[PDB]
Design a protein around this motif. Structure first.
Motif, PDB file in Angstrom:
ATOM      1  N   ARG D  13       0.829  -1.364  -0.018  1.00 30.96           N
ATOM      2  CA  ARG D  13      -0.149  -0.176  -0.014  1.00 30.96           C
ATOM      3  C   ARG D  13       0.878   1.364  -0.093  1.00 30.96           C
ATOM      4  O   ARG D  13       1.813   1.595  -0.693  1.00 30.96           O
ATOM      5  N   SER D  94       1.319   2.048  10.596  1.00 27.15           N
ATOM      6  CA  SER D  94       0.130   2.629  11.539  1.00 27.15           C
ATOM      7  C   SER D  94      -0.984   1.382  11.503  1.00 27.15           C
ATOM      8  O   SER D  94      -0.945   0.793  10.795  1.00 27.15           O
ATOM      9  N   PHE D  96      -4.723   0.712  12.731  1.00 24.50           N
ATOM     10  CA  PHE D  96      -5.848   1.452  12.900  1.00 24.50           C
ATOM     11  C   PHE D  96      -7.236   0.464  12.942  1.00 24.50           C
ATOM     12  O   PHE D  96      -7.177  -0.357  11.811  1.00 24.50           O
ATOM     13  N   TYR D  97      -8.067   0.836  13.830  1.00 24.78           N
ATOM     14  CA  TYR D  97      -9.172   0.088  14.179  1.00 24.78           C
ATOM     15  C   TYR D  97      -9.946   0.646  15.163  1.00 24.78           C
ATOM     16  O   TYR D  97      -9.375   1.702  15.677  1.00 24.78           O
ATOM     17  N   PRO D  98     -11.443   0.558  15.327  1.00 24.23           N
ATOM     18  CA  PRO D  98     -12.099   1.237  16.289  1.00 24.23           C
ATOM     19  C   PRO D  98     -11.634   0.822  17.681  1.00 24.23           C
ATOM     20  O   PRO D  98     -11.504  -0.242  18.052  1.00 24.23           O
ATOM     21  N   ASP D 141      -3.090  12.778   9.115  1.00 18.34           N
ATOM     22  CA  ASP D 141      -4.421  12.240   8.716  1.00 18.34           C
ATOM     23  C   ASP D 141      -5.210  13.487   8.509  1.00 18.34           C
ATOM     24  O   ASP D 141      -5.357  14.287   9.342  1.00 18.34           O
ATOM     25  N   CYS D 148     -13.487   9.963  12.675  1.00 20.62           N
ATOM     26  CA  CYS D 148     -14.632   8.762  12.542  1.00 20.62           C
ATOM     27  C   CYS D 148     -15.177   8.333  14.023  1.00 20.62           C
ATOM     28  O   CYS D 148     -14.100   8.484  15.036  1.00 20.62           O
ATOM     29  N   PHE D 151     -13.120   5.969  17.062  1.00 20.13           N
ATOM     30  CA  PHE D 151     -11.810   5.708  16.474  1.00 20.13           C
ATOM     31  C   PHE D 151     -10.738   6.679  17.385  1.00 20.13           C
ATOM     32  O   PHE D 151      -9.815   7.401  17.252  1.00 20.13           O
ATOM     33  N   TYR D 154      -6.965   5.785  17.709  1.00 21.39           N
ATOM     34  CA  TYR D 154      -6.295   6.358  16.791  1.00 21.39           C
ATOM     35  C   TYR D 154      -6.166   7.721  16.365  1.00 21.39           C
ATOM     36  O   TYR D 154      -5.171   8.351  15.968  1.00 21.39           O
ATOM     37  N   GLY D 185      -6.326  12.047   2.910  1.00 20.12           N
ATOM     38  CA  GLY D 185      -7.837  11.768   3.424  1.00 20.12           C
ATOM     39  C   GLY D 185      -8.276  10.446   3.208  1.00 20.12           C
ATOM     40  O   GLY D 185      -8.160   9.748   4.065  1.00 20.12           O
ATOM     41  N   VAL D 186      -8.888  10.090   2.170  1.00 20.69           N
ATOM     42  CA  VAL D 186      -9.153   8.814   1.869  1.00 20.69           C
ATOM     43  C   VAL D 186      -8.314   8.551   0.670  1.00 20.69           C
ATOM     44  O   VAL D 186      -8.249   8.980  -0.363  1.00 20.69           O
ATOM     45  N   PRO D 190      -9.124   0.422   3.539  1.00 19.64           N
ATOM     46  CA  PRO D 190      -8.779  -0.958   4.222  1.00 19.64           C
ATOM     47  C   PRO D 190      -9.269  -1.900   3.484  1.00 19.64           C
ATOM     48  O   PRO D 190     -10.412  -1.967   2.897  1.00 19.64           O
ATOM     49  N   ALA D 192     -10.404  -5.085   4.156  1.00 20.10           N
ATOM     50  CA  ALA D 192     -11.639  -5.675   4.935  1.00 20.10           C
ATOM     51  C   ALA D 192     -12.834  -4.979   4.517  1.00 20.10           C
ATOM     52  O   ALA D 192     -13.919  -5.577   4.868  1.00 20.10           O
ATOM     53  N   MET D 193     -12.752  -3.477   3.967  1.00 19.67           N
ATOM     54  CA  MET D 193     -14.004  -2.912   3.641  1.00 19.67           C
ATOM     55  C   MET D 193     -14.944  -3.622   2.505  1.00 19.67           C
ATOM     56  O   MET D 193     -14.322  -3.921   1.374  1.00 19.67           O
ATOM     57  N   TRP D 201     -17.528   6.479   0.604  1.00 25.08           N
ATOM     58  CA  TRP D 201     -16.393   7.152   0.929  1.00 25.08           C
ATOM     59  C   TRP D 201     -16.096   7.883  -0.280  1.00 25.08           C
ATOM     60  O   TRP D 201     -15.733   8.888  -0.291  1.00 25.08           O
TER      61      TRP D 201
HETATM   62  C1  LIG Z   1      -9.250  -2.012  10.235  1.00 27.77           C
HETATM   63  O1  LIG Z   1     -10.465  -1.971  10.713  1.00 27.77           O
HETATM   64  C2  LIG Z   1     -11.336  -2.465   9.931  1.00 27.77           C
HETATM   65  O2  LIG Z   1     -10.698  -3.329   9.054  1.00 27.77           O
HETATM   66  C3  LIG Z   1     -12.478  -1.720   9.668  1.00 27.77           C
HETATM   67  C4  LIG Z   1     -12.412  -1.047   8.234  1.00 27.77           C
HETATM   68  C5  LIG Z   1     -12.244   0.494   8.676  1.00 27.77           C
HETATM   69  N1  LIG Z   1     -13.508   1.223   9.157  1.00 27.77           N
HETATM   70  C6  LIG Z   1     -14.095   2.396   9.074  1.00 27.77           C
HETATM   71  O3  LIG Z   1     -14.859   2.853   9.633  1.00 27.77           O
HETATM   72  C7  LIG Z   1     -13.330   3.508   8.297  1.00 27.77           C
HETATM   73  C8  LIG Z   1     -13.185   4.870   8.760  1.00 27.77           C
HETATM   74  C9  LIG Z   1     -12.423   5.690   8.091  1.00 27.77           C
HETATM   75  C10 LIG Z   1     -11.971   5.401   6.569  1.00 27.77           C
HETATM   76  C11 LIG Z   1     -11.107   6.330   6.223  1.00 27.77           C
HETATM   77  S1  LIG Z   1      -9.779   5.692   5.428  1.00 27.77           S
HETATM   78  C12 LIG Z   1      -8.266   5.474   6.275  1.00 27.77           C
HETATM   79  C13 LIG Z   1      -7.967   6.384   7.268  1.00 27.77           C
HETATM   80  C14 LIG Z   1      -6.878   6.352   8.071  1.00 27.77           C
HETATM   81  C15 LIG Z   1      -6.046   5.133   7.916  1.00 27.77           C
HETATM   82  N2  LIG Z   1      -5.114   4.657   8.667  1.00 27.77           N
HETATM   83  C16 LIG Z   1      -4.428   3.542   8.366  1.00 27.77           C
HETATM   84  N3  LIG Z   1      -3.481   2.999   8.976  1.00 27.77           N
HETATM   85  S2  LIG Z   1      -5.426   2.688   7.028  1.00 27.77           S
HETATM   86  C17 LIG Z   1      -6.355   4.092   7.016  1.00 27.77           C
HETATM   87  C18 LIG Z   1      -7.675   4.409   6.189  1.00 27.77           C
HETATM   88  C19 LIG Z   1     -11.995   3.961   6.327  1.00 27.77           C
HETATM   89  C20 LIG Z   1     -12.758   3.163   6.895  1.00 27.77           C
HETATM   90  C21 LIG Z   1     -14.170   0.051  10.114  1.00 27.77           C
HETATM   91  C22 LIG Z   1     -13.248  -0.972  10.700  1.00 27.77           C
END
Ligand SMILES: COC(=O)C1CCN(C(=O)c2ccc(CSc3ccc4nc(N)sc4c3)cc2)CC1
Ligand SMILES: NC(=O)c1ccc[n+]([C@@H]2O[C@H](COP(=O)([O-])OP(=O)(O)OC[C@H]3O[C@@H](n4cnc5c(N)ncnc54)[C@H](OP(=O)(O)O)[C@@H]3O)[C@@H](O)[C@H]2O)c1
Ligand SMILES: NC(=O)c1ccc[n+]([C@@H]2O[C@H](COP(=O)([O-])OP(=O)(O)OC[C@H]3O[C@@H](n4cnc5c(N)ncnc54)[C@H](OP(=O)(O)O)[C@@H]3O)[C@@H](O)[C@H]2O)c1
Ligand SMILES: NC(=O)c1ccc[n+]([C@@H]2O[C@H](COP(=O)([O-])OP(=O)(O)OC[C@H]3O[C@@H](n4cnc5c(N)ncnc54)[C@H](OP(=O)(O)O)[C@@H]3O)[C@@H](O)[C@H]2O)c1
Ligand SMILES: NC(=O)c1ccc[n+]([C@@H]2O[C@H](COP(=O)([O-])OP(=O)(O)OC[C@H]3O[C@@H](n4cnc5c(N)ncnc54)[C@H](OP(=O)(O)O)[C@@H]3O)[C@@H](O)[C@H]2O)c1
Ligand SMILES: COC(=O)C1CCN(C(=O)c2ccc(CSc3ccc4nc(N)sc4c3)cc2)CC1
Ligand SMILES: COC(=O)C1CCN(C(=O)c2ccc(CSc3ccc4nc(N)sc4c3)cc2)CC1
Lengths: 248, 248, 249, 248
Positions: D13, D94, D96-98, D141, D148, D151, D154, D185-186, D190, D192-193, D201
């Motif tokens: 990535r 990084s 990144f997860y809720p 970010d 979000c 989060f 994060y 931004g975006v 991820p 997983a999405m 998005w």
């Molecule tokens: C890993 O946890 C999961 O698998 C799920 C997918 C993400 N989820 C989301 O609500 C969600 C929230 C925000 C964004 C904006 S894009 C971004 C921002 C910072 C970042 N920072 C990184 N290290 S990658 C990344 C990608 C995309 C998805 C729910 C849980």
């Protein structure tokens, strides 16, 4: 004796709530208005019935022109001629309408920049030159960095007003004058807006899914002019129920 | 053929450095000037000698007035007439001087808000209306939040310019027009200010205790107009050597 | 029934002025402390003399560790065990000392980032978990976070994290009716160590009055935020800094 | 010889695009990875195929613990061991997860605050302690002020990383080390999405209704480490297509 405040665009809506709350705290008030003469005189009458000789009106167009400086001079002068002093200036009057990039443009500039930034500047100059707890409160906009589409001149005006807040706080602090802002998010929606559109805005607000009351905005003005904010200058307090934190 | 750029206030200092470097990167350029005719033509001569018929000059006063709209239209048209297209607008021209709260005031308004904010807004409307890697770059100021004492209209104008950058970025993104800023700190000192006042500033800068060259500013401009900044819009890049991070 | 508030690092200086003014306003208070036992007890006794059974003390180290979550849960619990409710959380305790880039470094991390950021997050989770009404959290932030002192990177990181928490917790707790806000002093009570001539270099840089804020001036903004006058305010950080943060180098 | 760079989380990535583009610009690279051993070794093979001896891998868990400082020291040491110098650090890794307010919470804190902020600090300390165009770039970010929901840890980590960008730009500027950020931004969504959520998005982005490519993020990184950014320190460039300007 009682301190005195000037509130601009005080005949209705948030400016009214602010003049009333200042009046309830003990202030004498100059109710400035432009077109809302019946609403202004009616408010001054209600306030004078509550305590006599404590409210006057003052008419002035705050559109930018070569005579705006004299009109801003006269607003401040009106407080000194009625009450003998001027403790607080609230810059509340604002024009608000779309100016898409893609009325003459020079009229739009004059009204949106004049009322939202240039008149607050000239009033701040007159308030300071005509000189206890002196302060100025500017009504800013919590969404200035996430602007509504096609409102560039209004956004420009409210950004300039943040600059004035900081620059005037800096330059007037040596004279003991504080300058701060109150930044609503969505508060009283525009009179002409339909209920359906008002509810789309309400639904965006994290804290309560509703707009701020005029009194909720006036509360933060009341705080910044009070002795509880005596070290605060150059600060802008958002009163937006979290709206500015919400992503697209 | 090749892309074309307009640079306002391009005769001297930072605008000249931006004009040169855009020209070096292969743009054709309109050099705008107000009073600096000799200097503007002398720049156009140097650029046309390098590549014929690639640089023209355009005179306009950018003071706010009933005619600024027509002048801003003319600047943009002059790029279209010379080159058949207009890919880049650099809003570089700027008035700068103190306006103490304690020239008529409406003349200072017309210069410090007119040229710093209103002309960029009118240039932006003409540029967009007349329409790829299209983009606008506004010359902002890294010290907008920690303003110089007694420079309130200047500071208001640069804050308005940040507002324009954001609002125009949002509103023109649908047309593929990117809008960004470059915020210098201390660069080329005002030609008036002495060498003792100028070295005081130099010693405050974290990165090498020296001002930015004009070309360091132009470098960030070049980046933002390039194919390397194709997803960037609404961004303001400080180029200040760290000065704005330094506490009082 | 009187509402109840936890104030962290409440034994002295700013957190002490916050506990007193919340108590004057009618709040019952938990006075949290780490090393200052005598000062914390003495404050609880003064407050209890004014109104019986309105102040308790709670000892805890807020340094980051495996046990910090349990400690933070215990602080919140102590308020519910003493007063049967917890309306207000003030995250005031803070470590503050220089960590030059060029105590071990992991201790510096645990203490600067634990007290300034992780302990507030853990207390905020514990405060909200126990609610689910004028409920609010106020974080003590720092007006000079974007113009940081030289060699304070971990302290600066901790206070920026705290801004993030203030914003993220405001959004996430707003559906439970909990507001989250900050107060950002510039220069307030100066470090006990410091010579008057160094304190005077700081005082001279403040536009409004060329003096530091009193602890009470900072407490006043806290009182405003927890009051019914701030019922729509969440996610906001009020600088209380005399204009310090507006002054260029 | 050629300059050298460390890129953390460089196997996949955006860190991979950064490593590729630095390499394409002439740098030798340390590709740091945690779990993605196959993709790391595979990228280093591809780079070395293109210029021999220009890429190594370095494995390290960037979770906060009492041994994180030694792991960060090892990442920097490995660049010196392979290439004899270390000119550029990119803090890209990084978690990144809720982490809803209402794995153990001690593990959530260690991974989200360790990887996004503490490891960058320790890497910055080791980079500086081991020391003509030195610089560090932090992946921040753009949405850190409009987070979000759920989060908080994060977001706290990303805010801390802005504090680190500023504090380290100020403290290292006398050693000629520049420190800056790039704030997507975006960008790559991820893995997983689902595709419906991906599209929600995309539709929010004003410039193009699309996410940034990894290469567009890397472009801004190349700019900040280049000779064209030598007066830039403490700056964070948003690369977000306008997303952070969009109101709720
Ligand atoms: C890993 O946890 C999961 O698998 C799920 C997918 C993400 N989820 C989301 O609500 C969600 C929230 C925000 C964004 C904006 S894009 C971004 C921002 C910072 C970042 N920072 C990184 N290290 S990658 C990344 C990608 C995309 C998805 C729910 C849980
Ligand atoms: N309402 C909100 O949700 C909200 C949100 C963000 C920010 N704000 C800010 O909060 C403040 C109060 O908002 P509001 O909704 O009460 O404002 P408003 O009703 O839109 O305007 C208040 C008053 O402004 C005066 N005004 C307009 N053009 C003028 C001119 N050319 N000369 C002199 N006065 C003029 C008018 O007085 P007359 O009626 O006497 O002509 C008007 O009643 C404004 O600064 C606003 O921008 C409001
Ligand atoms: N230099 C710095 O250190 C510094 C610091 C902060 C921000 N900036 C920003 O960087 C930008 C360029 O800076 P600079 O120092 O190169 O600017 P400058 O020398 O102050 O002015 C640039 C040009 O603007 C034009 N200008 C001024 N008033 C005008 C008017 N009423 N109508 C038309 N043109 C007018 C002049 O054109 P003519 O000469 O043709 O009359 C001048 O050559 C500015 O936008 C500035 O705010 C610079
Ligand atoms: N004073 C200022 O000018 C100023 C300026 C900007 C921001 N602030 C912010 O305002 C708040 C109050 O400032 P202040 O000067 O009053 O604070 P302070 O005196 O530096 O610290 C407040 C209390 O924090 C507690 N604390 C420190 N390390 C701790 C640990 N590991 N665990 C638990 N508690 C710990 C201590 O409790 P014990 O004494 O009980 O050990 C200390 O009395 C702080 O968040 C500060 O960052 C203050
Ligand atoms: N993608 C976006 O839309 C977006 C938006 C805003 C900001 N950003 C920022 O831009 C940067 C790059 O984004 P991205 O989506 O490429 O990132 P990503 O795929 O989420 O993560 C990059 C790498 O970080 C490493 N990492 C995760 N946990 C770690 C740990 N405990 N120890 C060491 N490394 C660990 C992983 O390495 P291994 O795979 O080797 O285990 C992972 O491949 C990130 O800092 C991110 O927060 C991205
Ligand atoms: N029209 C509209 O699209 C429109 C756009 C935004 C809002 C938000 S609420 C507001 C903001 C500033 C303001 N400024 C004022 N003077 S009233 C006001 C009222 C309402 C209507
Ligand atoms: N030592 C010093 O060089 C030094 C550095 C800064 C100040 C500003 S005043 C402050 C700020 C944050 C804070 N945070 C705290 N916990 S006390 C405090 C006190 C005082 C002393």
């Amino acid at each position: 004796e009682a301190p005195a405040a000037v509130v601009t665009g005080a005949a209705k809506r948030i400016g009214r709530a602010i003049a009333v709350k200042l009046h309830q705290t003990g202030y004498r008030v100059v109710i400035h208005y432009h077109n809302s003469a019946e609403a202004a005189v009616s408010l001054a009458d209600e306030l004078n019935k509550e305590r006599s000789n404590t409210a006057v009106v003052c008419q002035a167009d705050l559109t930018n022109s070569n005579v705006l400086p004299a009109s801003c001079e006269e607003i401040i002068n009106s407080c000194f001629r009625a009450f003998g002093r001027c403790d607080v200036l609230v810059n509340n009057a604002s024009a608000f309408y779309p100016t898409p990039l893609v009325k003459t443009v020079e009229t739009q500039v004059a009204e949106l920049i004049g009322t939202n930034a240039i008149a607050p500047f000239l009033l701040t100059m007159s308030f300071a030159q005509r000189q206890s707890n002196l302060s100025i409160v500017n009504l800013c906009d919590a969404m200035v960095d996430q602007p509504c589409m096609a409102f560039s001149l209004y956004n420009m005006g409210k950004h300039a007003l943040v600059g004035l807040t900081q620059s005037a706080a800096l330059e007037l602090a040596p004279y003991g004058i504080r300058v701060n802002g109150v930044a609503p998010g969505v508060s009283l929606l525009p009179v002409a807006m339909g209920e359906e559109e008002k509810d789309k805005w309400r639904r965006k607000v994290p804290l309560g899914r509703r707009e701020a009351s005029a009194e909720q905005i006036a509360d933060a003005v009341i705080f910044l002019v009070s002795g509880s904010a005596q070290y605060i200058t150059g600060s802008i307090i958002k009163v937006d129920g979290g709206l500015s934190l919400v992503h697209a």
